[PDB]
Design a protein around this ligand. Structure first.
Ligand SMILES: C[As](C)(=O)[O-]
Lengths: 257, 23
């Protein structure tokens, strides 16, 4: 199986691979003539865990201001609850008739449903983390649009003192995100893009210092200095937009649950 | 100090894994 992040992989494994296997062993049809042992107590443990998960999820629904969580968490609760009802039914059916083929299939379907709803909740939380990172990226893009307004050395010192720490915060968030992505190609793209942006930052500040000097001296170097600053801002902005794009990618190879 | 969604989800998948280990 291929998951989006190491957090999700750490939770969905080992059961995702177990269910993936069990489905190949019981595609649909299930003619083995074997009995399933009493699942009443193991199923009661799943039901208790599912009810607890829905309770915990509802704490976020009741407190969050993020409307995309209030919208996406409740359908996952319904999926796990309905899937668990199937699992309880299946265990009751199998306790009455351990050799039942139709019940073994409620059982497998209920298990898939629990895994799917749990995966949906985890992806909702993941998507909210990504939105938080993108807000920071967009804030840097916005402050980069202010570079063109800087026409004095005092304003350049102020600009540098605001942008440096902001870029450090963005870099920290990208570093913390990339480290847990499972796709090496995406980690490499994020690390390379963030390094390009970090390397362009002193180039930008230097270009702004040249622009301010040319402005103050009222010399013939202003249009060249301005174009060189704009070129650097354009490249930094293109790179941050590439980060934003990579942060939202889901590879074709990721298993859907 | 309250249980996280991650801890609660791991309880779910552990219990589901333990159940499936019986088939
Ligand atoms: C943790 As780093 C690669 O942004 O210095």
């Amino acid at each position: 199986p291929v998951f989006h992040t190491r957090t999700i992989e750490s939770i969905l494994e080992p059961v995702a691979q177990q269910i993936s296997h069990l489905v190949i062993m019981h595609e649909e049809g299930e003619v083995d003539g074997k009995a399933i042992p009493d699942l009443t107590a193991p199923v009661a443990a799943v039901q208790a865990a599912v009810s607890n998960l829905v309770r915990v999820g509802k704490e976020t629904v009741q407190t969050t201001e993020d409307q995309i969580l209030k919208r996406d968490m409740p359908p996952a609760f319904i999926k796990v609850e309905n899937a668990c009802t199937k699992l309880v039914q299946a265990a009751q059916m199998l306790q009455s008739d351990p050799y039942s083929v139709p019940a073994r299939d409620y059982l497998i379907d209920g298990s898939r449903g629990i895994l799917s709803g749990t995966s949906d909740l985890l992806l909702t939380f993941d998507e909210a983390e990504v939105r938080k990172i993108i807000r920071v990226c967009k804030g840097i893009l916005e402050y980069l649009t202010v570079a063109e307004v800087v026409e004095t050395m005092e304003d350049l010192v102020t600009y540098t003192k605001n942008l440096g720490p902001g870029m450090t915060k963005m870099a920290k968030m990208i570093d913390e995100r990339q480290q847990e992505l499972t796709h090496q190609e995406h980690r490499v793209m994020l690390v390379n893009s963030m390094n390009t942006v970090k390397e362009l930052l002193p180039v930008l500040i230097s270009a702004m210092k040249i622009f301010v000097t040319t402005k103050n001296s009222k010399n013939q170097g202003i249009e060249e200095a301005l174009k060189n600053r704009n070129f650097t801002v354009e490249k930094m902005s293109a790179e941050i937009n590439e980060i934003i794009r990579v942060l939202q990618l889901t590879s074709w190879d990721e298993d859907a649950w | 100090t309250r249980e996280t969604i991650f801890e609660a989800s791991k309880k779910v998948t552990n219990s589901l894994s333990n159940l499936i280990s019986l088939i």
